[PDB]
Structures are given as C-alpha cells and as structure tokens.
C-alpha cells in the first residue's frame with residue numbers, strides 16, 4: 001500500500017512518521033486516474049463551522065523543514081525535530097526519515113484553505129478556514145496531500161503534479177511562458193526614489209546605468225506613478241491614469257506614454273513594467289459607482305496575527321480598503337491595463353496580493369474572492385500584456401498559489417532593505433528555502449538589490465544563481481560597474497540559470513540562519529554546467545518570541561563546510577554522456593580564480609565568515625581518451641560562468657571540442673593537456689594555459705557580430 005494509516009499510525013514505506021492519528025481523520029488514494037502514490041487526507045466533524053483545527057498526528061524525532069508565513073504576505077524557513085517546533089501558518093512541510101522524504105501539502109478545498117501548525121504536545125494540526133463566517137462546512141476529504149519518495153526534489157514535484165491533477169486550478173512552473181524580462185538586466189525605481197519617483201528620475205537612472213556599459217533592457221516604474229488621494233492616512237486610487245509626475249512638462253494630455261517613448265525610443269529599453277496593488281492601491285480604490293468600490297476592513301486570522309501581531313494595528317487594517325466589486329473587477333483591471341498597454345507598457349508588478357484573503361467576509365471567503373480577482377487579473381494580463389507580463393509580489397499564500405494558472409514570476413521573499421543590516425543574511429536564506437516550494441509554481445524573483453552597498457556582492461552573486469530576473473534599484477549615479485559587469489553583458493543580457501536556485505540536499509534540513517554550524521549551499525544548472533553558491537548566513541532569523549527579524553548570538557564568526565560535485569543535484573544532466581560519465585567535475589571558484597579537479601565524492605573545504613559567500617562553476621569532465629579530459633567553464637569573470645555555453649560537442653575521433661558561447665570577456669575551460677589550437681569563428685587565437693591546474697583561457701573580444709548570437713569555438717587538443 002505504501003502510504004497508510006494502520007493502528008493509529010501514519011506509515012510511510014514501513015516507517016512511522018506520525019502516531020496518535022485520531023479516529024476522525026479519513027484518507028484516500030482514489031482519483032479520476034485512479035490510484036495515487038500518496039494520500040489525500042481530510043476529516044469529518046460534528047459541527048458545521050467556518051474554522052476547524054484537527055490533529056493529524058503526533059510528530060517526534062523526525063527532522064523537517066517548513067515554510068511558514070511570518071507576515072501575511074511572505075514566508076520563511078524553520079527546521080526542527082518535534083511537532084511543537086512547526087510554526088503557525090506552515091504551508092509546506094518536508095519530513096526526512098533516518099533516505100525517505102515525505103511532503104505534506106496543505107490544500108484548498110472548495111471554499112476552505114488549510115495550513116499546518118504545531119502544538120505543545122507535538123501534534124501536527126490541520127487548520128481549515130474559509131475566511132467568512134457565512135461559509136461553513138463539516139466534512140473534508142482532500143485538504144492535505146502526503147507523498148513520499150527517495151529524491152527530495154522529485155518528491156515535491158510529484159506531489160505538486162498529483163495536486164494539480166485533482167484541482168486543475170494551476171499549472172506547474174515548467175508549463176508557463178516566462179516573460180522576456182527574465183533574459184535581461186533591469187532597473188526598478190523603488191529603492192532609488194520610493195514614492196517620490198518622477199519621469200525625470202526614471203530617465204536619469206536609465207541614462208546612468210547605460211553610460212557605464214551595463215544598459216538595462218527593462219524597467220519597473222514602481223509605487224509612485226499612480227493617481228492617489230487621502231480621504232497618518234492611507235491613500236486610495238482616484239483614477240487609473242498616472243499622476244502629475246508622469247505627464248509631460250508641456251502637454252498634460254500626454255501621460256505615461258511619454259516616459260515609455262523616452263525609455264524605449266531614446267534609451268533602447270525593450271520592456272517597461274509598472275507597479276499596482278491587486279486592490280488598485282494600498283488603500284484600495286476610492287468608493288464609487290464606477291468599479292463598485294465599498295469600504296472593507298481586513299479580518300484577522302489567528303495564525304497570521306500570532307506570527308505577525310503588528311498586522312492588527314497596520315494602516316490597511318484600521319483604515320480599510322475600497323474593495324472593487326467582484327462583479328466589476330475585470331472591468332477595473334482591463335481599463336487600467338488597456339490604458340497602460342496602449343501607452344507601450346509591457347507588464348505589471350502586482351503587489352499586496354494576500355489582502356484578498358482577509359476581505360472575503362460576506363463574499364464567499366478567502367479562497368473564492370482570491371480565485372475571482374485572479375481570474376480577472378489573468379484575463380486582463382493575457383489580453384493587454386501578451387508577453388505574460390505579471391510579476392507576483394506579496395503573494396505567498398496558498399489560496400493564490402493553488403490558483404496560479406498563468407503568471408510565471410513570483411517574488412520569493414520579503415524586500416531588499418538597504419538600510420536594515422539584519423535583513424541581508426535572512427534574505428538569502430529565505431529566498432533559497434522558499435524557492436523549494438514557490439519554484440514548483442513560478443520562477444522565483446530574488447528581488448532588486450544595490451550595486452554600491454556593503455552586501456552588494458552577497459546579493460548580486462545570489463541573484464546570479466537564482467534563475468530569476470536580475471535587476472537593481474540603484475539611485476542614479478550610485479553604481480558599481482565592476483560588480484555589474486559580472487552580471488550583465490554590454491547588450492543588457494544576463495547569464496540566467498535554468499532552474500530556481502535552491503538549497504542542496506544536505507542543507508534542506510539544516511537551518512543555516514540558526515544552527516551556528518552550517519554554511520548554506522545553493523545549486524542551480526545551466527545546459528552544460530552546474531553552479532554552486534556558498535553563503536554564511538548565520539546570525540539572524542525571525543524570532544518566535546520577539547516575532548520579528550533579529551540578530552542573535554553565534555559562537556564563531558567563521559564556519560567550515562565542504563563542497564562536492566554531487567551537491568549540484570542535477571549535475572548529470574550537464575554531462576554530454578551521462579551513461580559513460582564517472583562523476584568527476586571541474587570546479588572553478590569565481591572569486592579565488594582557481595580551477596580544481598574533483599573526483600566523484602571528494603570533498604573540498606570551504607571557510608566563510610558571516611556575510612561571506614563563494615561561487616563555484618561545476619562542469620562534468622568528459623574523458624575523450626586516456627589522458628585527454630575536458631570541461632568547459634565559461635565566462636570566468638562573471639558569476640554564472642557556465643550560463644554562457646549554449647552548445648557543446650566532443651569529437652574524440654579528431655581530439656576536438658566545439659562550443660557555442662554567448663557574450664564576451666575571458667572564456668575559460670579545463671583541459672588536462674595544452675591545446676594545440678584555439679579557434680574562434682574559423683580564426684586561430686592566442687591563449688594561455690596553466691599547466692598545473694589545466695585552466696585554458698582566452699578573450700572573446702566583442703559581442704557576437706550580427707544577430708548571429710553565439711561565438712563558435714573550436715578547441716583542438
């Protein structure tokens with residue numbers, strides 16, 4: 001049977017994960033299609049209610065990782081061993097068995113949303129809420145799904161697919177179209193000007209980054225462009241057009257079209273995005289007949305308030321939101337977005353998403369109001385921004401995730417806070433662990449950062465390995481181009497990795513923000529290399545007592561951990577012959593400038609102090625003949641070097657390697673022997689060769705000529 005409840009125990013492949021499983025908990029593996037390698041779990045109750053806690057069982061001595069909502073809008077990670085350690089508002093839970101990994105996915109069923117939570121007795125409890133007193137229920141069959149496997153990343157994906165086949169309300173990440181912005185460098189106005197952003201400031205920032213040789217090809221005009229008014233009072237949307245700062249200096253009938261033309265035609269941007277809340281603005285839309293806006297006041301749910309008590313006295317909660325009617329929500333988004341699309345705007349960054357869950361009172365609840373708003377947002381986006389131009393922001397609730405049918409980019413953490421020194425380590429931990437779960441739905445966006453900042457290289461390097469959009473919110477003139485050149489090429493393009501950056505197998509269950517012992521290792525893939533980033537992000541975490549992000553004591557400053565080729569979980573998929581491949585890798589340290597050969601399973605020591613990091617490119621070695629091995633590295637002066645290699649063919653019969661490389665700069669490869677000739681576009685070129693390490697090195701001079709996209713490279717051993 002494989003996943004079953006016998007006696008009062010939940011049993012996974014002959015290991016007891018939970019005990020004391022109460023009588024009223026019903027399971028089922030039946031489906032549409034029809035048996036399933038796991039178990040939908042529900043419960044039946046006496047009373048009809050809008051809220052229910054139900055013990056699923058008792059969890060002891062079984063290491064887990066959780067993503068839990070520390071604010072209404074965002075998730076972060078927590079590890080532990082006992083049920084009591086499971087935070088309120090836990091939305092994804094991963095359990096290990098000392099070999100076997102088990103995922104618990106609390107789900108949406110009908111009008112109800114579920115999350116998990118611990119209590120003092122180590123019970124894992126399932127909290128089912130509708131977010132509206134008028135919407136009540138007593139039986140549930142499908143509120144939690146449990147699935148087990150031996151690869152923890154595959155286990156997660158397989159459970160998500162099964163949940164998709166049941167709900168049909170969302171698509172997996174790999175099934176959605178990414179917007180073009182992910183392939184380019186961008187700039188976001190938010191940290192530069194905040195709400196004081198003007199059209200002259202937008203131009204200033206685009207101009208200054210292009211001047212330094214790293215021209216952005218997209219821009220996010222962030223919060224500050226819209227027309228808003230007060231009734232410290234909350235602002236509400238008064239119209240869908242732009243405010244006075246984005247009307248031309250001259251002719252007020254030309255609006256945001258102006259900064260769009262200037263960005264595109266004058267400054268050579270490809271895309272322009274703008275920001276709006278899902279509700280219009282922070283305080284919604286000013287009440288009116290037009291969009292049916294009526295004042296609503298956020299309802300507090302206990303889990304949220306327990307972890308984020310300041311949400312109780314937040315401005316949106318006390319002063320309320322003008323909530324567009326469901327009957328009119330499509331009209332609202334379509335008229336807003338039609339205006340923008342007609343002005344040359346290519347997408348929207350849509351924020352404040354989770355409020356919807358608090359406004360379902362009298363309206364069907366949190367799941368239904370969320371489905372309705374998202375259905376209409378998705379229609380409006382597909383219509384008006386057909387490049388799928390939507391970035392999800394403040395959207396870490398499951399209500400939204402399990403109805404994510406179209407949108408393909410999601411902010412994966414709380415904001416970048418240039419001025420809060422506690423935030424930087426936490427940001428990196430959060431973004432990695434959250435991406436384990438959010439990445440199954442959308443491509444994670446690791447947020448803007450600043451190029452001139454003490455933690456600049458820490459953020460930048462992590463963004464390079466994220467697989468996400470790469471953008472800064474530098475103020476005009478406050479740039480570090482030596483840093484930016486490691487991320488962005490002269491035409492604005494980046495070296496994006498294929499997957500969401502994620503923690504390695506050996507970090508999934510060791511909390512690198514809290515355990516004072518481990519470095520965080522993050523992996524990702526390119527076509528022909530993996531990449532691995534190592535971070536000491538110790539010293540700071542969300543506190544369960546203070547309920548906010550704080551510094552905490554750690555015994556050392558410096559920590560030692562180890563790196564292995566197989567830390568890059570999917571590294572086989574970079575090898576040109578994964579059946580013959582013996583598992584050995586060329587490991588290039590970006591910072592130290594060192595190439596080392598690492599045999600399958602051999603560990604390499606890495607030492608890092610807090611806020612330090614190191615990036616390694618990891619290339620499977622190909623064995624052409626005895627004594628002639630090779631592995632491509634890529635653009636060695638960029639963080640994700642391996643991201644440059646577009647094609648790779650080994651012709652062992654002619655002792656030759658053929659590569660298609662994009663970009664320009666110093667190219668690097670591993671070779672156990674001195675090449676005979678290195679050729680770039682049918683022309684021999686000079687190279688250097690470190691005989692001791694095998695590092696081959698030459699210059700790719702210009703960006704590819706044309707339109708012709710890749711440099712063709714032949715390395716002749």
Ligand SMILES: OC[C@@H]1O[C@@H](O[C@H]2[C@H](O)[C@@H](O)[C@@H](O)[C@H](O)[C@H]2O)[C@H](O)[C@H](O)[C@@H]1O
Nearest residue numbers: 071073190222223275351393394414415
């Ligand atoms: O207006 C700025 C916009 O709001 C941001 O949300 C912030 C908010 O400003 C905070 O201070 C908290 O309320 C919340 O935790 C936090 O994520 C978006 O992430 C995004 O960068 C966007 O530009």
